[PDB]
């Protein structure tokens, strides 16, 4: 496979936003790394389906929404930020205020 | 007896006139000439020529022309050639480039490249073999940041920081003599080479010139400490009498003065110019013709490189976020438009294709990326060939003169640059064996072996359960160079002539190779291999038009690069 | 302009192993009962005794093969070979004990060849 | 009052007569007989027996025959018994083996096994205690490679290599005095003992004598190197000056002579013949025959351990793809039929269970698995007794005596092989406390805990982050013996008297304990505990059948295996 | 669990299998690390099924095919290994050309 | 996400038990190292649902019953252990002979 550090790394994030979306699945409110997992993931899994860092800007604000997170958890994130391989090689997505 | 052109290849890698793809890239590679006597080739293995009585010596002591080292058949790239040789090591140095093996049997075997009891053999048949990457601009904020340097081919890293300190997340510093001590202690633990920045401010010389006592092997001016004319003149006085070189991130701002009151500060000195373009920082919009001047030695960071479609939405933000600047101030989104520029970005593509910047480098966690340098320079080589064409002077449809242009951005132009290309940054006998062998394939984009002083320091290998050592996972891992007190014979500390001199390296119980840093002060832009051009660049103040020889520099961004979704998982 | 990444463009032409050196044919059966294969740089004399060729025609040669492949001989097998000459000092140490220093010792190595019961010494 | 015998197993672990099944094996261990004196057992806890004027001694001092560290109530399963006792360690050596506590109180207490201030504690009640491992066929490919090793119970790794280099991926060899220092060097930092073997090549001495003389423990004479009889000769000649161990890989091509050619040039000298079957290399197709001789210390590797219906299948295919070989090449596949041979792999089996092979050993990623010698071992023995049925020597209707034997193969032996039984490779006063405890549930297959010069090296333990330490997740892990210098004072680096002598370890600055290598040229397959069996072992050549005593040996392929799909997750 | 070395990194081959095989599913055409991570949990998850070694170098030049990975992954695959634990213990599974 | 050494950790525990119950799933009786995930994972996540330690000591021992797993592996089990983070902090879940 040939992985790098950082390939190695961003798999624990893919695992991390599998386990937040079960619980979501059984009706949790999600907690602050859940959420934050659901969201980076979600922009990686963008970048590798060949979209744009603007239409992941915009999507990633739609992802969770309020009524998905415990009391406080929007508050909490500020942004959330991640690089992966789009189709013109690594760039930083950064998603603000996802959580309205 | 002979052999067909694809199964010679296929068995001892190519020979002269054939030509290797450089992994998903358009960029070919043609071998120029071949060392070897065709028919005495070395390899090694059951039945194979590197046997006692055979293509290896049993006579020979290792003091009498014998290796430690051997690597097999490798297609070198480098500066000085594209070509097919045998490497040969000893003492943790390359001491022979041609023909190894047994002069007792063998015709052409050269004379310090015996093959004997001592020698150990790498099989470099099929694979490119580099220097190891030279990163002058490295931020030390997280340790992790050294595997992923070794997994894309560096060696050696320059720069400064303390880890994740807002001054070392910002600036490539290690500041004043207790912090660069605390950092020399660390780099025993670092299984790569390392060299530390001090801080390039003052207005005293006594503040500056203690840092280099201390052990630092350059400085840095950073516009975030105060990137002043004082600042710019105490430290180039320091560093033409320490020997160091000394690099500028300029005053983005123009608060004290414009592009032209800082080469006034500069008076002519000797200096490396980071991050050249100006998106990574720089006297806004106009930096970038610093890269002109026969004294500057320019650089670019890795994120601009190459200009695609998505450079500018991610600049503008990364730069916001960054900076703490509000989309809804409109002195803030002056100052974003005013540093991340198309016209700039565009250009500096096709400055590196012209042989007007000279460098390559990271920019490591602070606005760069530790295990992109090699990839990113690849990736640039590639686009310009597809929109500028193959360059004039290229001949037999080979890509060897770019090849040769860009390999010599991230490996000797930096060691030259920072007074290390005595002991790094090229692939030439009495310099220290730091090598990276590279299946073609994955050429600039994951290093199969990196060697470190003559030894493995790092590899991508499989299981380390199995009974062979390819199964599942394959993955970069720390090999024996890396432990225990190898780590200290594998790796290089550079500093400055007056530390070793004051016995820093005692002191410290410092046990990593010393090396000295020295020659910085009487080169220029004329002493950058394949990369040498001076010229009058124009960056018009209302458009940012880039113009060289009244020809307006501008290219498209492209929507995709080869050496990316085809290699990497996320 | 199907990519195949790392791919190699081989120019024309065929590569001539051993150029210049003279070449010997000379048929070689293996007397054993055992398979016994042959490396392209091992002194030919100094081979396995039970392998019957004339010892005098492999003095100062080895198989003329691409460097690293060898020559198989089944248990019982006779077949030719083609020899070419050994280069640089033309001097052979260890293997089988059977020259230790030049090749040019034809005398030497023989009577070494056949007191030990190496076949083929005529 | 009377305990009855299951609650007192229950508690206290076996005592006579008792047996245990080993893992999920057919195996049963029969305990032979037990130092305790019954009420005086000792054990650790509230309100349990070792507490001040009770179990514990508040009386002397650490000088005065007092433990660092008791095991108590230890089912030990060495060479030398299958008994019950307490075992008493101090400097980092086993020095009681009997009863340990307070003579103050207690019966029967064994006089240098005080508990006392200064005792440490490990309960082994219910385990299974073992000499650590000694592994001697181990190629230094993979640093990785050492976990994988403490996690199956091995505690000395002896072979060679500079990480994944060509020679050291074919061959156990650190070739040359740099490539032997380097290794030193690297061997500071791996929490396992080690001894280096030179590279066993040659027709003049000195070469070969300048590696024993720069630290290494033995050589190897390997065929990819040219296992001509010249490098065997000299090998040979320098081991008997030197008094280090000799192994074998011999020429499977039959290039330079047979079987009884090798012989020949070892002329009755010392020799550990490694991989004996053959399927690891080796002439083709009787090497095996070696492991009749009286001058051969026979070892098997473990991938042909034991013989299983996807045994042949995976090494043909394994040796292709590792050979480069085509299966439309017929020399080629000759070359793999005359090599892997299931006449040769049935057979082994047998020459194992009959003390006729000494030794197991891995090849660990070469061709063999660093984790699974302690674990094809006892697969060995259990596929032998359902096949063969108990031993004629057996009694009570235990395996007392095949457990014995097997055990003696991957602890006692290896250790006298290379000259280093006087330090390891079994529980007896006087030797380093190399402990592993096994829960019988998981024997053979997990380590429960790892002692290493009397300290945990490596233990199965759960979450760091937890209130008690057997919360998941369980996983092997390094334990505070491998951390910081300590590391230097729990592991062995075994080198040649002559580099000892000449003060190798002061020139490289190693911390570890030093091991001498000695009294490897005076034994032979007599000296092999429990597997000294000499025989005239006849290979045919048309068909490969092995025969002894004018008996073909033949058994059949197993489909499945206990130690398997039980315990492992992939 | 009792988990060794060899048994936590191949939960890795696992996870990558899985991150592949959703990529897969939603319509991507594979990448070199994609197609080496499914063929190998496919041989590893064969051997815990019982299938025996030459089962598994037929089944494994059948996982994927050509038009399932991207131009050129095909012919940067000359082979995949992996080992597993079959019912007789650990055994080496190499599949050759496994994508035509 | 700000994971700490334990989060980390126990992300393999979850993996392991999705392993585990796509064995489980195409009909595998499950081994020692499987059934152990599998009754840890589901402890974990009833701490996150809000039981109480009460109710995951009585559910864990309904997780897995003997046909589900191989000869001997319920007799290898005495018992599992888990920390999670329930609503009220950390606390230690024991399930005592959890297959019978
Ligand atoms: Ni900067
Ligand atoms: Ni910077
Ligand atoms: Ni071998
Ligand atoms: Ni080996
Ligand atoms: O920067
Ligand atoms: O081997």
Same mark, same amino acid.
């Given at each position: ?100 | ?72 058949? &490798? ?42 009891? &001592? ?164 006297? &806004? ?17 890795? $994120? ?161 359960? &199995? ?5 599942? $996972? ?87 690069? $080869? ?8 | ?20 050196? +003279?070449?010997?044919?000379? #048929? ?5 009962? #055992? ?8 002194? %030919? ?7 019957? %060729? ?30 070419? +000459? @050994? ?5 052979? %140490? ?15 190595? @023989?009577? #070494?060849?056949?007191? @030990? ?6």
């Amino acid at each position: 496979m040939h992985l790098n550090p950082a390939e190695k790394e961003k798999l624990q994030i893919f695992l991390a936003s599998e386990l937040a979306l079960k619980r979501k699945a059984r009706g949790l409110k999600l907690n602050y790394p859940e959420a934050v997992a659901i969201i980076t993931s979600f922009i990686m899994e963008g970048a590798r389906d060949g979209k744009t860092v603007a239409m992941l800007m915009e999507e990633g604000k739609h992802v969770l929404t309020r009524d998905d997170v415990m009391e406080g958890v929007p508050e909490m994130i500020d942004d959330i930020q991640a690089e992966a391989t789009f189709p013109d090689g690594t760039k930083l997505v950064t998603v603000h205020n996802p959580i309205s | 007896m002979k052999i067909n052109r694809q199964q010679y290849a296929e068995s001892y890698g190519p020979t002269v006139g054939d030509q290797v793809r450089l992994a998903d890239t358009d960029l070919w590679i043609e071998v120029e000439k071949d060392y070897t006597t065709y028919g005495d080739e070395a390899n090694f293995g059951g039945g194979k020529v590197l046997r006692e009585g055979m293509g290896e010596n049993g006579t020979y002591t290792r003091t009498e022309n014998v290796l430690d080292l051997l690597l097999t058949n &490798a297609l070198i790239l480098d500066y000085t050639g594209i070509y097919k040789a045998d490497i040969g090591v000893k003492d943790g140095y390359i001491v022979g480039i041609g023909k190894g093996g047994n002069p007792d049997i063998m015709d052409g075997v050269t004379p310090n490249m015996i093959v004997g009891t &001592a020698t150990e053999v790498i099989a470099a048949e099929g694979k490119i073999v580099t220097a190891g990457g030279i990163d002058t601009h490295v931020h030390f904020i997280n340790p992790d940041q050294v595997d992923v340097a070794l997994a894309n081919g560096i060696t050696t890293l320059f720069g400064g920081g303390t880890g994740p300190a807002e001054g070392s997340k910002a600036t490539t510093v290690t500041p004043g003599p207790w912090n660069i001590e605390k950092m020399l202690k660390s780099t025993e633990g670092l299984p790569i080479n390392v060299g530390i920045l001090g801080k390039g401010h003052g207005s005293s010389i006594a503040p500056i010139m203690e840092q280099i006592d201390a052990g630092a092997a350059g400085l840095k001016i950073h516009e975030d400490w105060g990137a002043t004319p004082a600042s710019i003149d105490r430290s180039l006085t320091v560093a033409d009498e320490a020997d160091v070189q000394v690099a500028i991130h300029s005053d983005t701002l123009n608060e004290a003065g414009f592009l032209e009151d800082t080469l006034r500060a500069i008076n002519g000195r000797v200096i490396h110019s980071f991050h050249v373009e100006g998106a990574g920082g720089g006297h &806004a919009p106009d930096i970038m013709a610093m890269a002109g001047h026969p004294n500057v030695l320019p650089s670019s960071t890795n $994120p601009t490189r190459p200009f695609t479609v998505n450079t500018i939405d991610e600049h503008l933000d990364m730069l916001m976020v960054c900076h703490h600047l509000k989309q809804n101030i409109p002195e803030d989104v002056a100052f974003a438009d005013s540093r991340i520029r198309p016209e700039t970005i565009a250009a500096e593509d096709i400055l590196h294709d012209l042989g007007i910047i000279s460098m390559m480098s990271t920019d490591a966690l602070a606005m760069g990326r530790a295990g992109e340098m090699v990839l990113r320079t690849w990736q640039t080589a590639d686009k310009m060939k597809k929109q500028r064409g193959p360059l004039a002077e290229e001949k037999n449809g080979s890509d060897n003169f770019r090849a040769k242009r860009y390999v010599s951005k991230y490996t000797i132009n930096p060691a030259i640059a920072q007074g290390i290309a005595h002991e790094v940054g090229s692939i030439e006998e009495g310099k220290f064996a730091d090598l990276v062998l590279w299946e073609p394939k994955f050429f600039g984009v994951k290093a199969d072996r990196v060697i470190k002083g003559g030894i493995i320091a790092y590899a991508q290998i499989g299981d380390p359960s &199995a009974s062979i050592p390819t199964p599942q $996972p394959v993955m970069g891992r720390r090999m024996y160079g890396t432990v225990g007190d190898l780590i200290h014979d594998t790796n290089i500390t550079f500093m400055s002539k007056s530390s070793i001199q004051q016995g820093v390296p005692a002191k410290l119980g410092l046990k990593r190779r010393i090396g000295t840093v020295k020659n910085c002060r009487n080169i220029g832009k004329k002493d950058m291999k394949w990369n040498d051009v001076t010229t009058d660049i124009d960056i018009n103040p209302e458009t940012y038009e880039v113009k060289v020889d009244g020809e307006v520099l501008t290219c498209e961004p492209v929507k995709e690069l $080869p050496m990316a979704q085809r290699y990497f998982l996320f | 302009n199907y990519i195949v990444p790392g791919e190699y463009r081989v120019a024309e032409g065929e590569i001539e192993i051993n150029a210049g050196r +003279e070449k010997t044919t000379i #048929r070689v059966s293996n007397t054993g009962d #055992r398979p016994i294969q042959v490396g392209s740089h091992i002194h %030919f004399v100094e081979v396995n005794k039970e392998l019957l %060729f004339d010892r005098a025609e492999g003095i100062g040669r080895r198989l003329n093969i691409p460097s690293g492949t060898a020559a198989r001989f089944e248990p019982g097998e006779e077949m030719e070979v083609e020899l070419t +000459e @050994l280069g640089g000092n033309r001097e052979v %140490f260890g293997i089988s004990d059977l020259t230790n220093g030049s090749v040019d010792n034809k005398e030497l190595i @023989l009577q #070494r060849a056949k007191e @030990l019961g190496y076949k083929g010494v005529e």
